């Protein structure tokens, strides 16, 4: 059929009300990270966060398709910067990989979190904006997370 | 001083060679690094290809000034004859400058091969670009298709 690739970059630009150290965390400690991203319950999650380190996260959905997400870090500057690789694939089938970059910068009292992504949708993926709605409401699931262990 | 400039840039050639030659010139270790490793007053000090999803690619060398360019890529996604996918770090000594998500697609035309290379990627920490990587790419995708001709067979 259609073998093709769309490819597009979006940027999520977020203030979040605590310090950096704390914002890093959510993403370095396994048990927080799973819990603001993967849980909204995976059948595995596993975080090795440094670079080299492998992230996994695989999800059923309601009808028995396996949504797996596997990600491999690139670059890790504590508290100032996360660079990693994914790809997600839907059953067996690949649906797309991106370049993630997530940088942190101390503000007078919060933090500056800037998300950007750059995507690659494969052979007819309908993304349709998809996956920025969806980063959206997960980097809103983090703000809650910090505001819930304050 | 952290920082990082992203940046998105295509390639696209049409080679004169059939899309399995096409293909192979990527996915042979000792092909791929006749065009991509080979140049040229710089020491070449590793080259290695394990072609498969999941797999990785290495090439370092030395520049005349005794900086290692280490080039470090894994590969994501291939279908054979049609698209590799792959995300690479570019190191200069232990200072990473970039990072970077690849596609290639192929695609046959009436006469030979349609070739897209696509590139995002992202500079760091102020590291100067400014249009290398792309006139980079733009030269060693040329030494690709010196080499395809030059593998040709005679009429």
Not at 8 to 33: G, Q, Y
Not at 72 to 91: F, H, N, Q, S
Not at 113 to 126: A, C, P, S
């Amino acid at each position: 059929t259609t073998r093709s690739a769309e490819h597009t970059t979006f940027v999520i630009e977020r203030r979040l009300t605590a310090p950096v150290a704390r914002v890093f965390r959510a993403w370095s400690t396994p048990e927080s990270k799973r819990q603001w991203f993967a849980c909204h319950v995976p059948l595995e999650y596993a975080l090795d966060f440094r670079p080299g380190g492998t992230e996994r996260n695989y999800t059923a959905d309601t009808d028995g398709l396996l949504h797996a997400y596997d990600a491999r870090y690139i670059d890790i500057v504590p508290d100032t910067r996360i660079i990693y690789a994914y790809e997600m694939k839907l059953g067996q089938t690949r649906i797309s990989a991106s370049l993630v970059t997530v940088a942190f910068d101390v503000e007078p009292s919060g933090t500056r979190m800037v998300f950007t992504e750059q995507v690659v949708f494969l052979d007819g993926y309908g993304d349709n904006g998809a996956r920025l709605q969806g980063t959206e409401i997960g980097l809103d699931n983090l703000e809650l997370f910090l505001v819930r262990e304050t």
